[PDB]
Amino acid sequence: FLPKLFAKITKKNMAHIR
Incomplete structure (x- = not known):
């Protein structure tokens, strides 16, 4: 798993990625 410092x-943009 990767960090979500800004995620x-x-x-x-998150709900816009897909």
Whole structure:
């Protein structure tokens, strides 16, 4: 597993990735 330093703080681009 990889770190989510910004993967967790991000709630936009994340749901936009797919």
